[PDB]
Symmetry: D2
Subunit: 298 residues, 4 copies
Amino acid sequence: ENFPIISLDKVNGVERAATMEMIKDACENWGFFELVNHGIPREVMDTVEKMTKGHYKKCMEQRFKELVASKALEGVQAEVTDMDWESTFFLKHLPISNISEVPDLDEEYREVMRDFAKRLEKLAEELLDLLCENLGLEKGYLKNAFYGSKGPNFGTKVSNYPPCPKPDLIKGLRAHTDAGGIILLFQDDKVSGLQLLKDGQWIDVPPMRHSIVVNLGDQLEVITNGKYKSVMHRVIAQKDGARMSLASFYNPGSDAVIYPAPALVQVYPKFVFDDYMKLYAGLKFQAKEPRFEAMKAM
Amino acid sequence: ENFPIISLDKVNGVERAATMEMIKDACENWGFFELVNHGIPREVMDTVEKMTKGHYKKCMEQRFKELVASKALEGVQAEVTDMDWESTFFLKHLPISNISEVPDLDEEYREVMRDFAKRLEKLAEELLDLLCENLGLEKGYLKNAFYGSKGPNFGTKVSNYPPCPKPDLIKGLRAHTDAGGIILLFQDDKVSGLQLLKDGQWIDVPPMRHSIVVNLGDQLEVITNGKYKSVMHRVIAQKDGARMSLASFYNPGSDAVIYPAPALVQVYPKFVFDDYMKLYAGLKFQAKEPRFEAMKAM
Amino acid sequence: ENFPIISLDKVNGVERAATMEMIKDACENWGFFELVNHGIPREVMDTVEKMTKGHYKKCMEQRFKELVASKALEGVQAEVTDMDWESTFFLKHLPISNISEVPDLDEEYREVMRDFAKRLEKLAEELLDLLCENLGLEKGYLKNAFYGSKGPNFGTKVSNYPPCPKPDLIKGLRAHTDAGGIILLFQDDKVSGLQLLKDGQWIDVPPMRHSIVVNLGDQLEVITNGKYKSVMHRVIAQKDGARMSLASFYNPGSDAVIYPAPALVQVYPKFVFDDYMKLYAGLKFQAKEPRFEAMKAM
Amino acid sequence: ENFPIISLDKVNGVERAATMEMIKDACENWGFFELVNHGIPREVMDTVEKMTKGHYKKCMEQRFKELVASKALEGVQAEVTDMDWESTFFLKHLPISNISEVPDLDEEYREVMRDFAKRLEKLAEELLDLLCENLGLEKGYLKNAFYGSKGPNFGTKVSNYPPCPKPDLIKGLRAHTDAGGIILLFQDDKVSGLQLLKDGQWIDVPPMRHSIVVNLGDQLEVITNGKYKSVMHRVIAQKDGARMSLASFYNPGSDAVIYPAPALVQVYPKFVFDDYMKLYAGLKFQAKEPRFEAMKAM
Ligand SMILES: [Fe+2]
Ligand SMILES: [Fe+2]
Ligand SMILES: [Fe+2]
Ligand SMILES: [Fe+2]
């Protein structure tokens, strides 16, 4: 009944069996769990926060100079209330790290993001193995399924944003389930603003400090033949706090072939991960014959 | 073997049967035909041209003032070669004409577009009836199928554009078939730059003056159970000329139910026109369960 | 020492002289004053609020559908935290009201904005007359100076926005003085977030309900030969509240000739209002000879 | 009377004096000259062309995939005539080369741009010395004036563009003089489309192959106390050809102090180059007191 909050270090000790049973239960009945004692140092997370926030502040300062100047163009005084406070960019890590070639980051920043990205990779694969165990599969199974030819895709979206101006503005807002593998979310403050649908109703992720919030995608549901369902959610920015998010995605390689583990077995489909995303981006129906085939299906 | 060029007025005379046989043949074996003597006055088309071109010239003059000024911002001299010469906007006509409320047109312009849009509607419905006849269907059949509840959607895209900088830039460019009903294309100059794929190869639409180029969409293929195929094409702007296009679309109403005429009967599907477009815009797979169903299909 | 809060209705009564003396004092020593009892009904302001907020909510709902869909394009899940919550548009009123032809407002909205704009015009001209009186000028003087040929320019910027994500983000943010005539600001809630520089330090506009905040521009400083200085300010969106602003500007007509009243007399310049703005938009130096003349000046 | 076309290699020979006299005459009476035999190999220019064109073609292919996909979003078929064929980016070279960190260039491309940028720098400084000589100044004088503290700013704008859709669209288009030092323009084909105003009328730059077109900016006019005037021009893309431009700018360092050479001496002003550009970008009047000072000047 309570949202799973899990002290990962307990898997090294006498409490392991009960921690694995929480992980199992979250996987089966929540789709989500919040990790503490997960092995990424407080100091590293605090540095990632500070520096991301430093870069945000800079791009905001620059962005106001530019608003003032374009607005002057149209014979218009730009106010600070005209600001767009949302800023988001990505960083690839696997198979090829583009961290070196993304515009406008300090070197000291890129190296911090590098290290942090290696740490979370390592954490992800550990999590996948513990899922394997609970699941009766072999160590490495999911990392292997996710491998494809060149490897799993892994990146981190880095967001900075203001609070929602009022909750009823979210009233009518569609949620989703994530299409990929396993997602690890790192935020600032105490309140995420992250919510999951459970039995028709919205449950808040409980505020923690130095936590990582883990959730399973569509792909893990297929490989488990539905045993672990990817779950609907949303994330709304609270006046309370959490103005920054790092959402890192450990997804199957583009060419990877996804399908329910034979041991774990209606039957979920088999398919190449990239075709799941091409369905997703709307690039599987820009021809006529596909389209006619789909309307015959409905 | 020759692209169909059809003098529509001949349907009023002793030559009708041979003109209907061209229309039939184009419908079956070209998907396209070029109309002359189609009953829209030379004077009306020439006014539509002039005025569209007048409005283009204005939005270009304005657009250079703004480029000069934003470029100055970044300590940069804007050249005329920095110009974006492409300009396109739409006009609705049916079920509700938004021609009155589109920004930045002269009144004298809106009224010309109104009249012109009534004329082409009338021409479209005539064309659909002549298709009915060739097809063995009743007068009004297609207009009726297209009606839905509120009526057929009808609008005109108005484009102005420079020439392609070089043909091999189009080399690797995907074509398409139109998703809607029947399309009537009005251009300037002599060379369209419009091409259709016929038996694997690119055929140019032959240059004519005061012509209208007609082509059938995906919807007419379904209602004819494949007898009239919608055909692949593209349109590339020629150094030769044709720098302006008015493409008017007479499509089924959103809620209209499309399906192969029982008389005209594998079997094509039945479906609501709006679901064909939602497939098209990529809004039918932004949930997980649809997506899993589609991968099981492949 | 206290920010001027002025009950306008008191100019109809035994307290007039003391209210005029507040207006005089604010004009001379604050540049700003907050009006209550100003003669625009509570019901009208409350309707303007509600309806603006209704339109905001709609454009936000629509804006999230579009973010979800474009983000899907790039194989990316749009979150609600990716939202851009800032929305701003204008409405002209004088010399020609474009309220009828601005995209996407209910009719019931346009009529409310019309009425409201007539009311504030009337309030502005009253304020200018009371300035005349305090100043020793004739009734109508400033309205007349502002008239030019076709009339004074009058419009309203309508803004909706989230809170600033954190105050130190404003830390390093340039303020300004308004370039025009007289500005009347209508907000929601209680806290504006509006601040004025007075003797080197930031003073908050005091929270009021159904207030209008008035401030004088650069133009009124010139006509008063510096007696009424236009004052520096800024406006920052508070977590506390005030998520909406209507800032209406009563400025001199484009062709109006601005210059210190002979009675009110270094000497401020004389000039056409439009040249002050062209200086402002950076369109007075896009040629070489101007530029050389300015560097010789410095 | 004829546009100056100058074989630079002749400065190494018996013809030097007559070539220097052409350079002198162009500097005094044309502001522009076209260089051939200028010492940048045919092979290097041809490689720069090919590779720029290869990169253009790629960004165009990518840009059409994205248009098709966003247009589908709005239930709209993207045509090739909807294309925006204009593409432009910059490359810094001095004081710090950002060529390594600009997005989406082949390595083999960056190295070609590096070399090419060193070659043109070397050519620029040579040209400045020959100007010194004609002028009676010492070798290095202008390079030294341009040096400031960190060095001269040097970069190259790289443009690719379609033809102007029709000449009367340029009819009403403002020209300019360049604000910087000395500009070297490298194009493809034969016809630039570049024109200079000379005695009130438009003169075309004569078509040449493997030419470089040189022109003097506002800064060189000041240092020569008007002896060498920077001249008005424009560049329009011809159906004839020249679809690519590399415009490289050798300007004074930001902090450089520009002023008429004492030997060369109304008197032109003295000033820091960056203040000339800040005048230019419209950032010298975003405060009130500047503005009042300027209106008193007029
Ligand atoms: Fe998500
Ligand atoms: Fe088409
Ligand atoms: Fe202001
Ligand atoms: Fe130029």
